[PDB]
């Protein structure tokens, strides 16, 4: 006779978590273990319509990238103010929010 062994093969997982989250809820930050860094802004000005449109999500993404490059993972969005009529910056969308990190470990 001859016995029959076996071995369960394991396959490595491939996760892809998102770094920075947008948070319009200060309640969340106050109610969570987080590390304060500094307020970051994302502004997209248009000298002319030749540029790329100053959408709120556009300025928000600029702010998000600025936050992430500041080692932040959460942006406490406060005001997404699009200012218009400014000479030189016909339409400048400025989204301002605090760049924080979450210390949940």
From Swiss-Prot:
Entry comment, domain topic = Contains an N-terminal proline-rich region (PRR), which probably plays an important role in the regulation of function of RcsF and activation of the Rcs signaling system.
| GO biological process terms on file | cellular response to cell envelope stress; intracellular signal transduction; positive regulation of phosphorelay signal transduction system; signal transduction
Outline the segment boundaries, as ranges, of region: PRR: 3-21
Taxon lineage: Bacteria, Pseudomonadati, Pseudomonadota, Gammaproteobacteria, Enterobacterales
Instruction: Note the subunit structure.
Output: Interacts with DsbC.
Gene Ontology cellular-component terms for this entry are: cell outer membrane; outer membrane protein complex; outer membrane-bounded periplasmic space; periplasmic side of cell outer membrane
Cellular location(s):
Cell outer membrane
Give start-end ranges for the coiled-coil region(s): none
Transmembrane stretches, by residue range? none
Q: Which family does it belong to?
A: Belongs to the RcsF family.
**Protein name in UniProt:** Outer membrane lipoprotein RcsF
Residue ranges of the region described as Disordered: 2-19, 38-59
Query: Anything further noted?
Result: The formation of the non-consecutive disulfides depends on the periplasmic disulfide isomerase DsbC. The disulfide bond between Cys-80 and Cys-95 is particularly important for the assembly of an active RcsF.
Function statement: Essential component of the Rcs signaling system, which controls transcription of numerous genes. Plays a role in signal transduction from the cell surface to the histidine kinase RcsC. May detect outer membrane defects. The system controls expression of genes involved in colanic acid capsule synthesis, biofilm formation and cell division.
Q: What are the UniProt keywords, alphabetically? A: Capsule biogenesis/degradation, Cell outer membrane, Disulfide bond, Lipoprotein, Membrane, Palmitate, Signal
Chief location bin: membrane
| Biased segments, Polar residues type | 43-53
Topology with respect to the bilayer: Lipid-anchor
């Amino acid at each position: 006779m001859a016995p029959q062994p076996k071995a369960e093969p394991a396959k490595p997982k491939a996760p892809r978590a998102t770094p920075v989250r947008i948070y319009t809820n200060a309640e969340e930050l106050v109610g969570k273990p987080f590390r304060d860094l500094g307020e970051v802004s994302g502004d997209s000005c248009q000298a002319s319509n030749q540029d790329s449109p100053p959408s709120i999500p556009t300025a928000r993404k600029r702010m998000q990238i600025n936050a992430s490059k500041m080692k932040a993972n959460a942006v406490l969005l406060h005001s997404c103010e699009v200012t218009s009529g400014t000479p030189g910056c016909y339409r400048q969308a400025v989204c301002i929010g605090s760049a924080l990190n979450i210390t949940a470990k």
